[PDB]
């Protein structure tokens, strides 16, 4: 279960690495509609303090997440700047979060009568009174309850079905190294001359096999010229060789 429209779920993902490849094999084809950064460059171009919002709205308002488009939820529940960075991931929930009798736990607020600033959560429990008349009550004439309930019947058509969407936005707040991890693993010891990088030691040479004994706290090897000659691969624990071309 995800949080509703009026109070979106807050989760500040930080202190991790960069890996978003789990979305492709999670589900069949779905909507991405990425605008700021190209979708093929998410693994690289790391950011800091990703602002993640998770919530479910019907399919009518899924495509209204683009900046510059207003509406009923896109204007009064979640407002985006025109220079927005990042993009959302949306997918259907026809079998998981959709109740056969209609899920009514999801509620949304439409009456706020105020344009929202970007990136905040507002709570409006009070009831709005119209006609300049003191209402001070619930369910009366010229008084409207802002909260209204969703319906998740599976017999509904496309657009009225539940749609899980998670908003991902990337910002550089002076760019500290918080969430930035590549992988770039390639096990190839072919005894041919190669531009090798092991744990950040740039060099070119022919990688062969040796049997030198290294202490666990003793990684790099030197020589008389103070050059790296025998190294140890980071992923595994094997001393490669002392072999130039």
């Amino acid at each position, epitope marked *: 279960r995800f949080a509703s429209v009026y109070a979106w779920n807050r989760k500040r993902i930080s202190n991790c690495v960069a890996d978003y490849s789990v979305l492709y094999n999670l589900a069949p084809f779905f909507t991405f509609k990425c605008y700021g950064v190209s979708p093929t460059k998410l693994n690289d171009l790391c950011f800091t303090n990703v602002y993640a919002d998770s919530f479910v709205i019907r399919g009518d308002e899924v495509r209204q997440i683009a900046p510059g488009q207003t509406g009923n939820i896109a204007d009064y529940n979640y407002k985006l700047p025109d220079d927005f960075t990042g993009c959302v991931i949306a997918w259907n929930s026809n079998k998981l979060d959709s109740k056969v009798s209609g899920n009514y736990n999801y509620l949304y607020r439409l009456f706020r009568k105020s344009n929202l600033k970007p990136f905040e959560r507002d709570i409006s429990t009070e009831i709005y009174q*119209a006609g300049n008349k003191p209402c001070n009550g619930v369910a009366g004439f010229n008084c409207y309850f802002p909260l209204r309930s969703y319906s998740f019947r599976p017999t509904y058509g496309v657009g009225h079905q539940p749609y899980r969407v998670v908003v991902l936005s990337f910002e550089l707040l002076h760019a500290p190294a918080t969430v930035c991890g590549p992988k770039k693993s390639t096990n190839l010891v072919k005894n041919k001359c190669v531009n090798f990088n092991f744990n950040g030691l740039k060099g070119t040479g022919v990688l062969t096999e040796s049997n030198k004994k290294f202490l666990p706290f003793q990684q790099f090897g030197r020589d008389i010229a103070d050059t790296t000659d025998a190294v140890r691969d980071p992923q595994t624990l094997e001393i490669l060789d002392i072999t130039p071309c």
Partner: antibody
Amino acid sequence: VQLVESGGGLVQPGGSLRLSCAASGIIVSSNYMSWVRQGPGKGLEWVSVIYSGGSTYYADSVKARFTISRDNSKNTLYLQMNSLRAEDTAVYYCAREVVGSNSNMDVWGQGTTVTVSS
Amino acid sequence: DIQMTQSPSSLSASVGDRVTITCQASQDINIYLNWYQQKPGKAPKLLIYDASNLETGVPSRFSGSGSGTDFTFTINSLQPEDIATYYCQQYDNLPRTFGQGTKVEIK
């Protein structure tokens, strides 16, 4: 809760005036209303819709023709027309959105019919 | 854009008898679909909310149901004071669209 017509008159093409729907206590600045179009013998048409946040939505046939003003406390909504090519021979209804998800308001409003000819 | 048309254009032969009016939508519609009841030259008056809710005081013989790009409305009491025109309108799907016309008349 009632509504008051304001407008009317016969004008040539190329001329326009201010059409007004006045409220009877309802605040007309920060609320959601709309204007729709009706002709004798033909179906309904939708002129425009205004929200509390300033969101103006209207049909593409009346693009760049209508501008709408909301009073702070005079309880009256104004509209000025532009580029009259004699297709406004109709009556306007000033109304409120019927229901978001659950409502039982049933109050409506009147308006004037205008004909445009040489 | 929603293009919607209805077969019962002129129900002028109904005098207190079974009435089967309907509206069909080009795309699939949810429950949210309503009607306007207006006299010729008069502002419409609401009678149906969200395809299932009714007014405060109206005759209770009215019935209706809508699912799968179609709403059906049936009335059995043809009272003389409610001679007017019935129109369909759909919301929550921008842009808003309105019906082309239904005629009901009692002899």
